[PDB]
Structure formats: structure tokens, C-alpha cells
């Protein structure tokens, strides 16, 4: 069962307060370094890690009573998935994925996202030729060091939903 981690208290405190939908988007993306939430072993280091955000930020704050985080994260995710911006859709896909990875490990989580509309939006994003092309070509930051494209990472992740 999920349990609040001991570490990274600064991340825990970040979410124990009023957090807007716009702020959650900035955190989930992490293109702005001031909002970049990672850990030592995060797969990439130059964009946020949505698994860290759920595990260390959102779930601990939810548990302390900041229940508005669930609806607000869902709206942040809806917005990101409809943004038409490669990195943001990628980060949306990675947050739904993060829930699944945390479910696999912890076997039970504080809550489960309402994700039907987010899933739909993602499907519709990936039907758009210009979005697929941006994702196929996305080679900024650490993506430049992988043969595996953003697009294919996204596609293989969607298949696991």
C-alpha cells in the first residue's frame, strides 16, 4: 500500500498549500527550472518527473487534506493533453503512466485519476499530423541523446494504458 515517503520534505511542503491549475501544469512540465521536480535517479534530469510529483507531492498533500489536488491535477492534465505542444502532451502521458507505475509498486494509492477525458484527448492529439510530427522530431535537451523518439515513447506508453 502507498505510504508517504520519509524523504524530500521540501517537495512535500510545496504542495501543502493552495496550488493553482496553472502552477500544477508548470510543475508537471518542468521546462521552467524553478518548477522542475526530479530526483537523483529520474530517467531524465532536465524536465519534471511526474512520478516524483505524485509520490512526494500530490499524494502526501492529499493525505493531509488538500483534496482539491485531484480535480486540479485532472484539469492540468486535460489542458496539457490539449495543448498541441509535444513536451506537454508527453508529460501528460507520463503522469498517467506514473499513476500506473505507482499502482504496480504500491498496490493501492490514495486516489485514482478520472482519466477518461484525458485519455480521449491524448488519442485525438496523436491523430493530428502536426503534433505527431513535432513529437517524432522532438530532440531538445536529453531527447537528443536517444534514438528512441518522443513519438515512439508516447505510443508504447499509450498501449500500456
Amino acid at each position: 500500500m502507498y505510504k508517504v515517503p520519509k524523504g524530500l520534505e521540501h517537495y512535500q511542503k510545496m504542495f501543502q498549500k493552495e496550488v493553482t491549475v496553472n502552477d500544477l501544469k508548470k510543475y508537471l512540465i518542468g521546462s521552467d527550472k524553478e518548477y522542475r521536480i526530479t530526483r537523483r535517479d529520474s530517467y531524465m534530469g532536465d524536465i519534471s518527473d511526474p512520478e516524483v510529483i505524485l509520490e512526494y507531492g500530490v499524494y502526501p498533500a492529499f493525505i493531509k487534506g488538500y483534496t482539491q489536488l485531484k480535480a486540479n491535477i485532472e484539469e492540468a492534465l486535460l489542458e496539457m493533453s490539449n495543448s498541441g505542444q509535444a513536451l506537454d502532451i508527453y508529460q501528460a502521458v507520463q503522469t498517467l503512466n506514473a499513476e500506473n507505475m505507482l499502482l504496480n509498486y504500491y498496490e493501492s494509492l490514495p486516489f485514482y485519476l478520472n482519466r477518461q477525458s484525458i485519455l480521449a484527448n491524448i488519442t485525438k492529439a496523436l491523430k493530428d499530423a502536426h503534433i505527431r510530427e513535432a513529437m517524432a522530431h522532438y530532440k531538445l535537451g536529453e531527447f537528443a541523446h536517444y534514438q528512441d523518439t518522443m513519438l515512439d515513447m508516447v505510443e508504447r506508453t499509450i498501449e500500456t494504458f
Partner: protein
């Protein structure tokens, strides 16, 4: 002051990750010259000044003979990467990782198996506590509360990987490097520089078609899970079957 340490500190501040505490940041700066000197003594870098210059350039380079000397250690004992059960699961389950242990063609950070054997066990051959090992490795408290897991390339695998020319040294822009990575083929281990171990990058292991649930059950039952003649990912992305043994272990008393 000294210009080399001024640029060092400036560069660190520019790249510092959001998970780094003020205390770690302060220790990283304060201890910098001890790590520079360690690298000089190991013939890893030309001089303490050169250590700082290479850190700022982000381009870590080393002399052939030094890297050959260091590889000898790994060839003798094999290679080790300690990790959590959660991270082992992610290698199999997380689709962006493409069923590889390590960052696809970008590889896996390792130390020598001998070094982890020396550092993680007491003189009575007892595994140190999770708390002690989390401290040694500078990870978050509770990282190993579910077990100290370990990837092991054996000597034979290591030798054949070297014969292919697939061993790498880290650089400033290596995927998986962060703001606490340093030059000198060595780890930054905080104020306790006695915990610092050598550092190389090994080719990733393909776990295509393996299931995390079953692998973790085999580990629970026998203490390890082994791949004979694993498929490795070359730096250029080639998949190549290499003779030797790779293990995923839950570390335990001798």
C-alpha cells in the same frame, strides 16, 4: 580566491537540481578540492586545476592508460549498480525505458563489484543496514527499505564488453548525470569521501519479454535472477548477445 573554483561554483549553481538540499550544495562546494586532489592521486586528471576546468567545460576526458588501469579493476571483479526494487520494476514496466536496464544506448552508471563488496558489508560479512547504505550512496531515506537491489555484470561479461570497446566514461552531458556528478571517474559521496567509489558507464541490458512480477519472485525465492549470455545495448544502439552472466540481486548477508 582562485578562478578555477569560482567558475566551478558558478557552474554548479547554474545546474543544481531541485532535489539538492542547501546542506548538500554547501558540502559539494566545500569538499570540491578534496575530490580534485583524489582525482590527481589516481592519475585520473592532470592537476587539481584541470579537474575544475574540465568540470566547467562539461567535457570530461581522460588518458588511455588511466582508463585501461581502471577497467582492469572491473574486469577482475565485475561491475555493480545498487538500486531500489521500484527502479528494478520500472526497467521492465515503464514503456519509455524500452525494456532495458540502463538508459538504452546511453548505458548504466556502475562501480566495480569489489568496491561495493568492500563498502556495503561489515567485517563479519553482514550487509550494512538499509539506513547505513542509503547514507553511503547519498539517496533519499527509505530508498532501500524494500531491499538493497543490485545489478551485477560478471567478470566474463565485463571482459567481453571491453573487447567490443563498449565501456565508457561519464561526461557532463551524459544522460543520467546530475548536478552531483563530478570528473575523475569517481562518485561524489559527500563529506565522507572515504565512501567515494570509481565510476564507469556500462552498456545497458535488454530485458525484452521479461516480466517484472516473475523476475522479482525468482529473486525472492533464490536471492537473484540471472541472464546467461545477455543481450546488451551498444553505444551506437546495436543489440548484441555477449557471453557471460548478468544478475539482478537482492543483496544479503554472505
Amino acid at each position: 580566491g582562485n578562478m578555477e573554483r569560482d567558475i566551478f561554483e558558478k557552474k554548479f549553481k547554474e545546474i543544481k537540481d531541485k532535489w539538492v538540499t542547501d546542506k548538500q550544495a554547501d558540502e559539494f562546494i566545500e569538499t570540491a578540492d578534496k575530490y580534485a586532489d583524489k582525482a590527481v592521486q589516481m592519475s585520473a586528471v592532470a592537476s587539481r586545476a584541470e579537474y575544475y576546468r574540465m568540470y566547467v567545460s562539461r567535457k570530461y576526458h581522460y588518458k588511455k592508460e588511466f582508463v585501461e588501469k581502471l577497467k582492469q579493476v572491473y574486469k577482475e571483479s565485475g561491475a555493480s549498480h545498487v538500486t531500489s526494487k521500484k527502479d528494478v520494476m520500472l526497467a521492465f514496466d515503464d514503456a519509455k525505458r524500452k525494456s532495458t536496464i540502463g538508459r538504452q544506448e546511453n548505458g548504466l552508471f556502475v562501480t566495480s563489484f569489489a568496491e561495493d563488496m568492500a563498502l556495503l558489508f561489515t567485517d563479519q560479512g553482514k550487509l550494512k543496514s538499509a539506513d547505513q547504505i542509503e547514507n553511503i550512496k547519498g539517496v533519499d531515506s527509505g530508498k532501500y527499505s524494500d531491499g538493497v537491489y543490485q545489478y551485477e555484470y560478471d567478470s566474463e561479461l565485463t571482459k567481453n564488453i571491453d573487447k567490443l570497446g563498449y565501456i565508457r566514461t561519464a561526461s557532463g552531458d551524459t544522460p543520467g548525470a546530475n548536478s552531483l556528478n563530478i570528473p575523475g571517474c569517481q562518485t561524489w559521496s559527500g563529506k565522507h569521501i572515504e565512501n567515494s567509489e570509481s565510476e564507469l558507464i556500462f552498456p545497458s541490458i535488454s530485458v525484452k519479454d521479461l516480466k517484472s512480477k516473475a523476475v522479482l519472485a525468482e529473486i525472492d525465492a533464490k536471492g537473484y535472477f540471472e541472464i546467461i549470455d545477455p543481450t546488451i545495448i551498444a553505444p551506437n544502439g546495436d543489440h548484441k548477445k555477449v557471453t557471460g552472466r548478468f544478475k539482478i540481486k537482492k543483496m544479503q548477508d554472505r
